Amino acid sequence: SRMQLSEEQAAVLRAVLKGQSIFFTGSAGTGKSYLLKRILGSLPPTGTVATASTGVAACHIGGTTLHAFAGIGSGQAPLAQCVALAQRPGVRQGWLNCQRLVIDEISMVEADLFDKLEAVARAVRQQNKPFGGIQLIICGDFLQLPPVTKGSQPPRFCFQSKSWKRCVPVTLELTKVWRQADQTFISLLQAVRLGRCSDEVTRQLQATASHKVGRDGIVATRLCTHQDDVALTNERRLQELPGKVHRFEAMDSNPELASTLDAQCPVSQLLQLKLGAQVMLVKNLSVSRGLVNGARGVVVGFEAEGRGLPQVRFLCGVTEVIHADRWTVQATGGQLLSRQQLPLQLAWAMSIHKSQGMTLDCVEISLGRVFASGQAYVALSRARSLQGLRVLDFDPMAVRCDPRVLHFYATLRRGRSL
Ligand SMILES: Nc1ncnc2c1ncn2[C@@H]1O[C@H](COP(=O)(O)OP(=O)(O)NP(=O)(O)O)[C@@H](O)[C@H]1O
Ligand SMILES: [Mg+2]
C-alpha cells in the first residue's frame, strides 16, 4: 500500500492522467520526485520517457538524463546539426516513440537548451505543435540549483524560454514539506529559500555550529561547492588512516566505457577502503533498517573470507556487511551500460550538486561566502533534522535568490487564492 497522496499531489496526478502538459513545483522535500515515481507507475510504460536534468537526479526515478535522451551532442551546434544528430539510429526512435516526457530537476535546464529541444522535437517528429506534441510532465524548484550551460554565456532560467508557457500551460504546487518533520526547521528553511534571513533566522543557523551531528566513529559529510575539494578531502582523510587499503574493483559490461559510467553512477571504478573510512551507502538496501540511499556510516571491519567485504556501522546503529550491487545506465541512443560495484562512496565530503534531490542526516557546511542562487538552500534542505546539520561561519551573504525567480513565482501566483 502506497502512502496516501496529499490533495495537492493527487491534483497533479489527475492532470497527468487527463493528458495535460504540466509543470509542478514546490520547496525541497515536498514530494516532487516521489510523485513522479507514482505518476510513472500510473502510466502505460510504452511511450513514457523518464528523464532528469542530471545523472544524479535521473537515477532517483529510474530514468535517463535529458542530455542522453535528446541525443543532440552538447546542444551548442547549430539547430540543423542538432536535428541531424537527433535523426541518428536509436536516437530518432526515442524521439518518435515518446508520447510523455518526464523531466525532474528542471531548474538546471537553461532556457536556450529548452528552446533547442522544443525545435528538435518538432523537426524530428514532423509535428507542428509545441514540443512536437509531446505531453510534458516537468517538476523542480527554481529556488534550488540554478541553470547550467555547455556554452560560455550567462544561462537563463528555463521559464525564460519564449516557449515555456506554451509548452507547460498549467503549473501546480506542492506546499507541504515531508523530508523534515520539525516545523521549526521547516520554517527556517523556507526563510532561507526566499532569502529572508532575519536576525532570528541567522541566530538559529549560527547556533548549529555547536551541533554534534555524528555518533561513535561517524563524522559529518562536508558539503562543498566543487568536486576538486571533495576529491582532495576524501583522498587525504583516507590516506591519513593507519589501516591497510582494501580494494574493490568494479566490473562493467563494457570496461572501455568506464568513463561514461563513472559520470552517471554514485560509485567509482576503484573503491578503496580502510578501517575507519567514512562512507555513504548509495543504494536502498532496506527502508525498514534505515539502509537507504544517503545513509552515512563508518567501516568497522572486513570479512575474513572471500573478497573480504566491508562491515559498516551506520548512524542508525545498524552494522551490516555490504555486498555487491549493480547499476544500469541509460546512455544515448538506447545504449545500456552496467557496473557491478559495492554501493559505497567515500563521504568525508560531497558536492552540493551531487546531493541534489537527496535526503541526508550527518552534514556540515561553511556558509560565509557568496554562493550560487539557491545553492545554500539546497545544502541546508538535505538534512532530515536540524540536529544532523552543522553550519559554520553562517552569513546571509551565502543566501541569494535570483530576482528573476521571485518574479516568476509572484506572477505565477497572481490569480491564486493563496
Ligand atoms: N504523501 C506523502 N506522505 C508522506 N511522505 C511523503 C509523501 N510524499 C512524499 N513523501 C516523502 O517526502 C520525502 C521527500 O520526497 P522527495 O520526493 O525527495 O521530495 P522532492 O520535492 O523531490 N525533494 P527535492 O528534490 O530535494 O526538492 C520522501 O521521504 C518521501 O517519502
Ligand atoms: Mg526531488
Numbering used by the authors: 203 to 620
From the manuscript:
The hPIF1 helicase has the domain architecture characteristic of the SF1B RecD2 helicase subgroup. The overall organization of these domains is similar in all nucleotide bound and free structures determined. hPIF1 has three structural domains, two RecA-like domains 1A (residues 206–381, blue in Figure 1) and 2A (residues 382–435) and domain 2B (residues 436–548, green in Figure 1) with a SRC Homology 3 (SH3)-like fold, in addition to the small functional domain 1B within domain 1A (residues 280–300, cyan in Figure 1).
Here, we describe the first high-resolution crystal structures of hPIF1HD, including an apo structure at 1.44 Å, and a complex with the nucleotide analogue AMP-PNP at 1.13 Å. This interaction involves a significant movement of the residue and the 1A–2A inter-domain linker relative to the apo conformation. Importantly, this conformational rearrangement of the 1A–2A inter-domain linker (W380 and R381) during nucleotide binding causes a significant ∼4 Å shift of the N-terminal end of the α9 helix, which in turn induces a structural rearrangement of the 2B domain. Interestingly, the ATP-binding pocket in the 1.13Å human PIF1-AMP-PNP structure more closely resembles that in the yeast Pif1-ADP•ALF4−-ssDNA complex and much of the water structure is conserved (right), while there are substantive movements when the human hPIF1 apo and AMP-PNP structures are compared. Consequently, loop 412–417 becomes more flexible and allows a distortion of the β-sheet β20–β19–β7–β18 and adjustment of its interactions with the hydrophobic core of domain 2A. Comparing the AMP-PNP structure to apo-hPIF1, the observed overall structural changes during ATP binding are small, corresponding to a ∼2.5 Å anti-clockwise shift of the 2A and 2B domains, as depicted in Figure 3A.
